[PDB]
C-alpha cells in the first residue's frame, strides 16, 4: 500500500482455523533478499544485515496501532479487555488520559 | 468452548495427545534413560503440551 494513514476495505472468504497461536509482526524495509529460489536478480539490492534472515529488527517502534478483528463485525480483543478495547495501540502521541 | 463438530479438524498427533515418554514402546523408554548421558534421544520426540 503507498502514501498516507488510515483504512480502506476488504473481506476474505472460506474456511479453516484451529490450532492457531499468536500473530507476530515487525516492519522491515525492502532490502537484500530479492526472493528465495532465485539469484542475480534486478530485484536484488544492498549487502548489509538482512533483518528477514537474521533476528535483527530496528523499525519495531514505528507502529501506532494494530487492530485485529475477525469476520467483519467481530472484534477479537473484544470483551473490554483493554482500556482502548477495539485495537491494540503501541504508542500514543499526545496522551491526556494517562494511558 | 470446545463443543461437538470439532472432530473433522481433529486427528492430532504430537500437537495434542499423550506425552512423549508414553507414546514410545516401553523398551525404548528404558534404553533412552540408561544411555542419555553419552547419547541423547530426548530431542528425537516431540512432546505435546495442551
Amino acid at each position: 500500500i503507498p502514501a498516507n494513514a488510515t483504512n480502506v476495505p476488504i473481506s476474505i472468504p472460506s474456511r479453516n482455523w484451529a490450532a492457531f497461536r499468536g500473530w507476530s509482526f515487525t516492519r522491515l524495509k525492502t532490502k537484500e533478499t530479492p526472493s528465495l529460489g532465485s539469484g542475480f536478480d534486478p530485484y536484488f539490492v544492498y549487502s548489509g544485515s538482512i533483518p528477514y534472515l537474521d533476528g535483527t529488527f530496528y523499525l519495531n517502534h514505528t507502529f501506532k496501532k494494530v487492530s485485529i478483528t475477525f469476520d467483519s463485525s467481530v472484534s477479537w480483543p473484544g470483551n473490554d479487555r483493554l482500556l482502548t478495547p477495539n485495537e491494540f495501540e503501541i504508542k500514543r502521541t499526545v496522551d491526556g488520559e494517562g494511558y | 468452548m470446545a463443543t461437538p463438530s470439532m472432530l473433522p479438524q481433529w486427528a492430532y498427533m504430537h500437537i495434542a495427545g499423550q506425552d512423549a515418554s508414553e507414546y514410545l514402546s516401553p523398551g525404548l523408554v528404558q534404553f533412552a534413560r540408561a544411555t542419555d548421558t553419552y547419547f541423547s534421544l530426548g530431542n528425537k520426540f516431540r512432546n505435546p503440551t495442551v
Binding site: - | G27, D36, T37, R46, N47
Partner: peptide
C-alpha cells in the same frame, strides 16, 4: 507466544533391560 517442546524420559553409569 512460541512453541516446540520435546521431552526426555545406585552407582555406575548404565544398566538396562530395554528390548522389543
Amino acid at each position: 507466544d512460541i512453541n516446540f517442546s520435546s521431552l526426555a524420559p545406585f552407582m555406575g553409569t548404565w544398566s538396562d533391560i530395554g528390548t522389543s
